[PDB]
């Protein structure tokens, strides 16, 4: 995955679970949740972006 | 008749409340799942949205039309 890639959220406790988002940036450092994904639908708190782990996102073909 | 019907409603609400309590504090997904596949009870939480949506549809259908006919007669 990279910037601009489309991924499916696999985190169950997510307002965008099973949904598709756009990767903003994948951090190359040793952070726990490097993948930053932007969504079109705001969550219940109003935010439309979140940091996800490498195993919590699945790239769409 | 009134006493027994009120007791009936109370008992039904209690049954559903204790089902909810079982879900909260006694339900174990691991026991009700074998190799990814889910048993008859665990599958009720998979189409839970379907169940709730169709209960909502039936309730709205009946309410809309019963009230409509009653108000039309009124």
């Amino acid at each position: 995955i990279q910037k601009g890639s489309t991924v499916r959220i696999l985190r169950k406790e997510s307002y965008w679970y099973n949904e598709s988002g756009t990767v903003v940036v994948v951090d190359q450092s040793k952070v726990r949740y490097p993948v930053l994904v932007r969504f079109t639908k705001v969550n219940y708190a109003g935010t439309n972006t979140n940091n996800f782990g490498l195993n919590e996102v699945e790239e769409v073909v | 008749y009134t006493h027994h019907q009120y007791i009936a409603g109370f008992l039904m609400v209690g049954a559903f409340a204790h089902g909810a309590i079982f879900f909260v504090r006694d339900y174990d997904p691991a026991v009700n799942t074998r190799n990814g596949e889910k048993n008859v009870l665990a599958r009720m939480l998979e189409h839970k949205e379907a169940i709730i949506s169709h209960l909502s549809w039936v309730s709205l259908f009946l309410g809309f039309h019963t009230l409509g006919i009653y108000v039309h007669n009124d």
Binding site: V42 | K48, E49, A50, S53
Partner: protein
Amino acid sequence: KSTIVDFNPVETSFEKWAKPGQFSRTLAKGPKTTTWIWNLHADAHDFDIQTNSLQEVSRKIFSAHFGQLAVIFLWLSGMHFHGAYFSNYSAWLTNPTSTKPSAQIVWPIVGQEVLNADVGGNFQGIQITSGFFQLWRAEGITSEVELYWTAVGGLVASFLMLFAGWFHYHKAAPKLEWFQNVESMLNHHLAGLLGLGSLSWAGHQIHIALPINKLLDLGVSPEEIPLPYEFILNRDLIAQLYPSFNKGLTPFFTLNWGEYSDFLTFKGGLNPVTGGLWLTDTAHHHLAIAVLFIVAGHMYKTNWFLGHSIKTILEAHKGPFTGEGHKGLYEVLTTSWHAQLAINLALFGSLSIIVAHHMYAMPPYPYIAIDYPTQLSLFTHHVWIGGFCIVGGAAHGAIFFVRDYNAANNYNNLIDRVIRHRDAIISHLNWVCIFLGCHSFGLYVHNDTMRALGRSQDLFSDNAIALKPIFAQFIQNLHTLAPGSTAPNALTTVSYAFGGDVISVGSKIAMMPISLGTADFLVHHIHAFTIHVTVLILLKGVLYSRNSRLIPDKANLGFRFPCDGPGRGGTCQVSAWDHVFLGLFWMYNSISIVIFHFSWKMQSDVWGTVSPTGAVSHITGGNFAQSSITINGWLRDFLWSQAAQVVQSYGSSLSAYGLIFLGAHFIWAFSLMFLFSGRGYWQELIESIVWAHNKLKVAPSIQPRALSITQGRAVGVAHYLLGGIGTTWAFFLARIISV
């Protein structure tokens, strides 16, 4: 480049009409959830958060006032047009005591033409309880052409006010200094508006209403009554009815004002022909009011070395118990629109309630006292408006405290000292509310349980333990003795409610001494208790709007917020808005009890018919004295008994009242869904509904969200008020029109 206005401040364009939410910084970005739609209407008139300049807020308020006055003028024009075209006003003029006023006919669709009642005068339509016919008769309007011309003038005036609002927002908007001339504004509103309006109305009454109504009462038919302009061009048509116009204005300018006693009287009582106040008394009243208000308008210093400065008056009113006194109040009331709105709305609602009382107490229109539906509707409507306006004044006082209150500018003044001992005020008001409720209501419950136990001598009744309102009876005695003793130039008491003779017009009672017994004691203390509890809720909201022991920084959360969280044991409804919500509920309770007391007492002990020999028979038969002292009595002899006409209205011309009765019950019960439930359940149900929509690929882009907590409360209270007030509306109207 005028010193009072700014020229062409805002361009007249439709571009912002196509951008909803442009006023708000947060809503301008566009909707993402359905909460945006509701926030759009909740912030439309909150001009404080739309601009950071007091000048812009003031200009918006000024133009909004113009729009509101245009709407009011359009409403009045519609009323006059309906009177001119869809009314039986001409027939009602010739038979005021036997024709019911109707000014709205119903189209014949879906069988609704049954609503066109037999109002009399060869007319079919809805009976009118707004009293416009009596008002028009008091104005001297004897033809429907005059109603049409008044409607045309109302339309022209409404367009003029619309143009004025547009002009003063887009072409010449006044500056802040112009708005802050409170001395000049008070001078003008007191002299010009109030005094000159009273003077102009006195002139109209004297020259048009006095002769035309005197001819009408003499039996002259409206067709042979001269046109109103002929009473001005001919000093002989009015000098025959009032033989004092023959002297002209010479007695006025020679200080010989005694000559004008023909048409400027001081009589009191009611006109025996029409049952209303003497229009000569009304004209004299308006003249005196005009002079008093014009004099009162020359008080505040505006542009000369003459008059008062409100700042100097307030700052001089200090005291040992009040510290700095009223210092800083002038700055508060000249820099905060919310404080002015609070004061004006509170006094305006109180004035509306006072108007409601004085209306039925002293009927000011011809043939309005014998139109019981009109009297009941006018009283109930004005009391409801007064209660709503009072709650609004409390709400805007709380809003001022949250938003526009500056602690530095109010050091040790009255506002500061009130906040410093808010605990004492609220605790003592709590004790008073408990005392009053315990006593009034528990005396009611004691009466109920003594009656249920077969102990009739243990009640708080007249034939039992008696609580005579001696103080009110003393006042009643003082007023009935006033003519000739304390008001030596009066011929009759101000109102026959205080005592005197039974005034009947066409065998129908207009006014009669309202006896006060133990039943009135209990209901009056119920009124006091309900008013005190409403004041408690609203004052607790205003005083604890900024901080408390629970939330020391409640002002940082704003005026309108649902809570601070489930902590501290639970911090629901701590806002100040949530206090205007509960206070709205309690105002509904208080006003409902007030109007119930009025309806039952009038029907049982004032209204009715008078036999030719002088025997008085009332609508219900005096059951108020003995059966209004128990809650079962109120349930049975008032609610159950007088609800008979509403439930038996089906198939008749009052069936619309039964339908509205049922619909208002439905709406009131609907409110309880929002009042009793919470947002989380509805959001989680919307989750499954959204799942179904997504399964069918029909999920809207604007994400559907359950109504916010504050909006849920607002919807609940609005539906509750609408349902309750509509139920009482249908009940009252059907009952008082049937009988």
